[PDB]
């Protein structure tokens, strides 16, 4: 019938020649939908394959010797590291823009803005701007609750006043998720069990200021759940945002599957949640109401980024298949109304994000 | 001192 | 420091164990201030939770299989329907009083008197009395102007001589209200753009017979307005009630907020108008003067009913809080006099409803 | 025919 969502395959990295073995979390990066960096070791020579999403049939290979390469979200600026050695280049003008030598190895790092790179060390998190004459700044000391985890993600709210470090580990035979939520303003950090999450700005009707929301999904002991809470003191004059919780489904076949990524469309006020084994869920950011759910990938998915054009989510999966899913603006309302038999939601979404159904 | 990437 | 009104929280349905997901238009009903009926899906077992407002702490749960449950306004008599199947039980006597299988599904239905249930199908409205052997009687065919709308309300004047069926729909990125006002006597029906409304008996000075007023609020393209008109032909010998019209205010934050409920206190001749997002307005029934306006709920409201005890209005919001606002009799006159600097309206209400200020 | 609410 119809579908809420709109699925579409953009690429098949293997058609480009990329070895399947490099299509994974530690060799393939997608800091945004503009590029995909894959580090391959062709021969005794290690190199980076930079795929320009607006020109897929022309990947450019360059020799590197970094243990990690992460492209800027907007420009052909790349951050390369080797141990404690960190260097940033502007590929087009062939120069080294900045360089820093950390006192600890960087276990995980990713761009968190157009001009800032987050650095995660076994015991602390740093933010490093590209803006002028700068160096790493320690944002906070890691919490003991993540000691030992494999760092898989670091996120930030719009104003960078709320940081979220996330790690996972094998415990009690199930992938357990460990998150640290640090408050830059109150110099305090809270431990939280969670697998995937994201922040988002939301303009509650009757509020003059936006609200900063924190939304995470976790498959805990009580099974799957998804929370949506307002983080920090609500803007003077605003109404608090009612924390919402709803369970996230997991079919019997999906025994050890869990939340792996989450993007939020400020355009539709929708939450995309993708599990490790290809399941996509749609939830209303405002109510947490689960709109749609189905499987969009048989192969596991290890990386995603907001899909700017469609306001959706784009990710790569083990097969080297670049997939994207967004809101089918022409039918979402009709689907919610007819299929979901949820007039209220449908009525709200239609008026809220100026949609038509 | 030495660059992690070689440009052409 | 004073206030016209007098706010009060009665309950927090969550403190009673009600799932926040069932605190909504289609699963929570409040046909009066004597009961609240929530339909929950505890397990694979559907059931109804009846909450006796005079004994909140002791909700009673009963397995049901009805797609809708509405409690009689005065007795533990419940209307339960499943598709075209309609039954009515007296819970205490645990017996099926009367039963009827409609020929069309009922999309909306609500008690309109201590003994009559109104049934709305896609193309007609019926009345069904519990008085003896009766059956449903078609009152009128639905006007095409509500074809497609989501039925949200049905109201009647004291003598069930005027019938109002209200619907809403998402049109032009805003909730537009479509009302159908039927005249039982003249067998004719007039289309009106409106969101909320209510009838009321009012005895204009110099008139021996009460007058039947019809008040409705709407946020049309010309912004929000509230009308108060006499409906039908003035009783022989009565003067006609001069139609009133005023602006209902919506702040800038309230962008898509609209009227959602209205209750009129014959006791103080005041109109209580609550918006979809928790705003409360107080107007004089007679003049249509706005006496007070300010926010009473941060969570949207989806159901109200007259609050008999205080002669005010009592509704429930998405959080599960049971709210109630009424005239603060000891201090509604001074407020008007000193804060609104409206001696005339103050002097009029004092004398008119027999108050003191 | 049947009942839509099981009573105690």
UniProtKB/Swiss-Prot annotation, chains A, C:
Residues 256-299 are annotated as: WD40-like repeat 6. Residues 106-147 are annotated as: WD40-like repeat 3. Residues 194-255 are annotated as: WD40-like repeat 5. The modification Phosphotyrosine is found at residue 182. Residues 66-105 are annotated as: WD40-like repeat 2. It comes from the Eukaryota. The modification Phosphoserine is found at residue 65. Residues 1-357 are annotated as: Globular terminal domain. It is found in: Cytoplasmic vesicle membrane; Membrane, Coated pit; Melanosome; Cytoplasm, Cytoskeleton, Spindle. The lineage of its organism: Eukaryota, Metazoa, Chordata, Craniata, Vertebrata. This is Clathrin heavy chain 1. The modification Phosphothreonine is found at residue 103. Residues 148-193 are annotated as: WD40-like repeat 4. Residues 22-65 are annotated as: WD40-like repeat 1. Residues 300-328 are annotated as: WD40-like repeat 7. The N-terminal seven-bladed beta-propeller is formed by WD40-like repeats, and projects inward from the polyhedral outer clathrin coat. It constitutes a major protein-protein interaction node. Clathrin triskelions, composed of 3 heavy chains and 3 light chains, are the basic subunits of the clathrin coat. In the presence of light chains, hub assembly is influenced by both the pH and the concentration of calcium. Interacts with HIP1. Interacts with DENND1A, DENND1B and DENND1C. Interacts with OCRL. Interacts with ERBB2. Interacts with FKBP6. Interacts with CKAP5 and TACC3 forming the TACC3/ch-TOG/clathrin complex located at spindle inter-microtubules bridges; the complex implicates clathrin triskelions; TACC3 and CLTC are proposed to form a composite microtubule interaction surface.
